[PDB]
């Protein structure tokens, strides 16, 4: 803005003396450790004097001073009201009373493994804090405090300080990282200023320091939101005989990710705000903290009208943004502020406004001009059935938006994406999105540049989005990649669609089970917001490091990943066994894998996988659905029984022999599939014939196989038998010549 450079950086770079006092172990009070440190790094006393007095209790009367705002916004961004432990797990207070877990404090990278908590990190890993603090000092030196570089500083915290706790001498705030706590405190502290500079006050010591309990009751914050509607009608507009099948499917789910990104980053500079206020962004849904005044509400209503005119001019009611705001006082604090109906129940008030506006979509003057007619069109866009601006891209007649999506699918491999003015694939009013190389930023004229899966600072001063993406090969080669070095593998490619089970039920309510409700704060759900986006948007490429697959989309709860079938099955086993260690077993997910032949269309492929996901949601909730709706196993007996226990023992038999070939395996599948009471006897006869038919050296190997196979045939609980069928499908598929 025009003065908020003094307020935003000072309310963000305060408590960074809590890093150096953490690093080298000084005995000085932490309010001064970042105060003096700023002097040998930069020189701006107005930002500095907030950090000199952000504690506001060692010397409350020294210097109308904006550190008054930094004090109250530190209390409210903290879930509590304010001795050397690490950052605790967020899932220590999620759900049930389980073991305590603590993060190992590290930085982030594009090649770093997921840093899981454990019970062995109660001590204080002091040595990494030297490596953290020198990473700060190398990039805070050559740096300028402006709206150009208002955004590179946030990733400097969200990568490095992402696991460092805050105020470790405590009993409650054990899991609020300093990257998140500085992000929320700078988010609130701007919103007090936009709440106070609109009312007309200039002094900050009588409505903040003395009327704090009045401000604890004063409704001074909106919780804005939006909801991008019609996403799956836009993404899954693929059909059989689509000329670009998978590239358009990977482009449109990325297109609406940038559009959901640009609805955020264009509403915040229409206001006087920035990316600290955005508490979350996901698949269309995103949550803000804005100022509670008429100068910002009328900006929201105007921008909702102005942005829907953009969507209507390019999509014709396929997409619709729906705002909603809930005014709230300081009631998202665990200090018994009407604990049942206060925290979610004003986060729900903005959610009811979205439902009121998703149901009363347009108004008079738009719908009078929607169906004005006067258009003798002849050919339609054969993808999205639109009419205007038809071009002839590779002898099909497509529209103007779907033309750029083929161009955006060619520009998708780049690392940088810019907001041009008139350069194709529009995502806003006077805003178009373009893929661009690194040094082409000198050439092209832009307004904001988005960089994808990156943590380097660079010269672009960009905005760091995180889109999950991987390709080990082209999509049409994944069938022929399913061989081994021998040649033994079935030429199939599998598609998995994962989904976290009850994600909004774990986001919104989530933490109220432990305690009396003293963990139902904003900062827990803001840390839960990051940790579910930090997993699926960043860590999923580590799980797909060398696997022969292609993550088409991973965002929010949902993963959609085509690939070779040995690795896709290995992917989700490796994903969940990481994801249950990431969350201590809570937030179980569900998956559905489907084998498909070579050269089948992706719309036939992506649909039936969706049939298996919605079938696996209805097992009870927590299941994998291999290949077909009738292999719906729990994950808690698919990895520990099918994929690693039963398939290991079948593979241990059929490699230490040359006698029992595939014909023995195939006649077992008929016996496992029909399963009347008569086939129990016929199986007991079939194994006992071959027990003496074999050569008498390896008769114990067959007898320790057959009496162990007959054991899980007659169990009469069905949970030990259908697994044996699925274990033998995964063995013949691995030995298919």
């Amino acid at each position: 803005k025009k003065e908020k450079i003094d307020l935003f950086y000072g309310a963000l770079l305060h408590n960074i003396g809590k890093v150096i006092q953490r690093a080298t172990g000084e005995r000085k009070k932490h309010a001064l450790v970042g105060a003096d440190w700023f002097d040998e790094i930069a020189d701006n006393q107005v930002i500095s004097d907030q950090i000199r007095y952000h504690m506001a209790n060692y010397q409350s009367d020294k210097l109308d001073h904006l550190a008054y705002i930094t004090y109250i916004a530190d209390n409210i961004a903290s879930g509590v009201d304010r001795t050397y432990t690490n950052q605790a797990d967020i899932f220590n207070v999620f759900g049930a009373q389980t073991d305590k877990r603590y993060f190992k404090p590290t930085v982030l990278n594009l090649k770093s493994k997921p840093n899981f908590a454990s019970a062995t990190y109660e001590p204080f890993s002091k040595g990494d804090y030297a490596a953290i603090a020198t990473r700060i000092k190398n990039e805070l030196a050559e740096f300028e405090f402006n709206q150009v570089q208002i955004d590179s500083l946030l990733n400097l915290f969200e990568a490095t300080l992402s696991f460092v706790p805050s105020s470790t001498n405590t009993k409650e705030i054990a899991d609020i990282s300093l990257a998140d706590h500085s992000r929320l405190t700078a988010a609130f502290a701007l919103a007090i200023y936009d709440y106070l500079e609109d009312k007309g006050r200039h002094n900050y010591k009588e409505d903040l320091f003395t009327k704090v309990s009045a401000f604890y009751e004063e409704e001074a914050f909106l919780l804005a939101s939006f909801d991008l509607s019609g996403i799956q009608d836009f993404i899954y507009n693929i059909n059989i005989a689509t000329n670009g099948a998978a590239k358009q499917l990977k482009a449109r789910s990325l297109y609406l990710d940038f559009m959901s990104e640009y609805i955020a980053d264009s509403l915040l500079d229409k206001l006087g705000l920035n990316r600290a206020n955005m508490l979350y962004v996901g698949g269309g849904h995103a949550y803000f903290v804005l100022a509670n005044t008429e100068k910002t509400v009328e900006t929201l209503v105007q921008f909702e009208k102005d942005f829907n005119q953009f969507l209507l001019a390019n999509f014709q009611t396929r997409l619709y943004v729906a705002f909603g705001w809930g005014s709230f006082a300081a009631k998202d604090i665990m200090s018994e502020l009407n604990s049942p109906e206060s925290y979610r129940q004003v986060y729900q008030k903005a959610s009811r406004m979205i439902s009121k506006k998703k149901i009363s979509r347009y108004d008079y003057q738009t719908l009078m001009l929607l169906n004005r007619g006067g258009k003798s069109s002849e050919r339609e866009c054969e993808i999205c059935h639109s009419v205007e601006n038809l071009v002839s891209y590779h002898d099909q007649k497509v529209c103007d938006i779907c033309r750029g999506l083929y161009q955006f699918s060619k520009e998708i491999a780049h690392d940088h994406f810019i907001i041009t003015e008139n350069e194709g694939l529009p995502i806003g009013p006077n805003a178009c999105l373009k893929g661009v190389a690194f040094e082409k930023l000198s050439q092209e004229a832009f307004s904001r540049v988005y960089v994808k899966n990156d943590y380097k600072a660079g010269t672009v001063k960009a905005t760091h989005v995180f889109v999950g993406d991987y390709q080990c090969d082209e999509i049409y080669n994944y069938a022929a990649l399913s061989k081994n070095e021998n040649g033994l593998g079935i030429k199939r490619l599998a598609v998995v669609r994962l989904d976290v089970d009850d994600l909004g039920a774990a986001f919104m309510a989530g933490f109220s089970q432990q305690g009396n409700g003293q963990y139902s704060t904003l900062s827990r759900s803001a840390t839960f917001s990051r940790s579910m986006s930090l997993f699926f948007k960043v860590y999923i490429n580590q799980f797909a490091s060398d696997k022969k697959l292609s993550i088409i989309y991973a965002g929010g709860d949902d993963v959609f990943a085509i690939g070779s079938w040995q690795d896709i099955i290995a992917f989700t086993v490796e994903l969940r066994e990481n994801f249950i260690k990431w969350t201590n077993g809570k937030l179980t997910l569900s998956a559905g894998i489907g084998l498909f032949a070579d050269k089948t269309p992706i719309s036939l492929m992506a649909h039936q996988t969706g049939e298996l996901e919605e079938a696996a949601k209805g097992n009870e909730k927590d299941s994998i659905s291999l290949f077909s709706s009738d292999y719906t196993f729990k994950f808690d007996r698919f990895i520990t029984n099918v994929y690693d226990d039963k398939l290991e023992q079948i593979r241990y038999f059929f490699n230490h022999q040359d006698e029992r070939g595939k014909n023995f395996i195939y006649k077992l599948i008929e016996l496992l599939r029909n399963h009347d009471r008569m086939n129990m006897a016929r199986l007991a006869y079939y194994l006992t014939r071959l027990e003496e038919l074999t050569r008498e050296t390896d008769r114990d190997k067959f007898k320790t196989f057959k009496n162990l196979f007959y054991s899980w045939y007659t169990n009469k609980n069905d949970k030990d038998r259908k697994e044996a069928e699925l274990a033998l499908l995964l063995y013949i598929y691995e030995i298919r010549k």
């Binding site: 009471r677 008569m678 006897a681 006869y685």
Partner: protein, 121 residues
């Protein structure tokens, strides 16, 4: 008598209820009944279990009458088969055919006797 939901568990119990060679401890707990005397009984029923599929029941009732001949006759020769038709209630079940679906239920009942006999020793 034997229904569809029990005739294999009946035949599982009948092999266990059948006696064993308690003496002659050279691979002991072996049966007095032998495999080849048992497969002579199933060779009667297995050629009706596949002509029940093809033909009517109205033509098979001449050989279904003959199964009471030879299950008695094989029981009269060796005392081991004599115990089989007592333990496994075969002469009771053979007089209760009356249609195709019990003929196939009895002929699957004889296969259940051969299956568990091969299984248990």
């Amino acid at each position: 008598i034997l229904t569809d939901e029990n005739y294999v568990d009946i035949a599982e119990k009948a092999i266990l209820k059948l006696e064993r060679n308690t003496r002659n401890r050279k691979n002991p707990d072996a049966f007095f009944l032998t495999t080849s005397k048992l497969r002579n009984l199933l060779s009667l029923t297995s050629t009706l279990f596949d002509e029940s599929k093809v033909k009517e029941y109205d033509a098979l009732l001449d050989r279904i009458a003959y199964l009471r001949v030879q299950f008695v006759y094989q029981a009269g020769r060796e005392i081991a088969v004599k115990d089989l038709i007592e333990k496994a209630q075969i002469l009771e079940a053979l007089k209760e055919i009356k249609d195709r679906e019990t003929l196939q239920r009895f002929c699957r009942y004889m296969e259940a006797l051969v299956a568990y006999f091969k299984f248990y020793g």
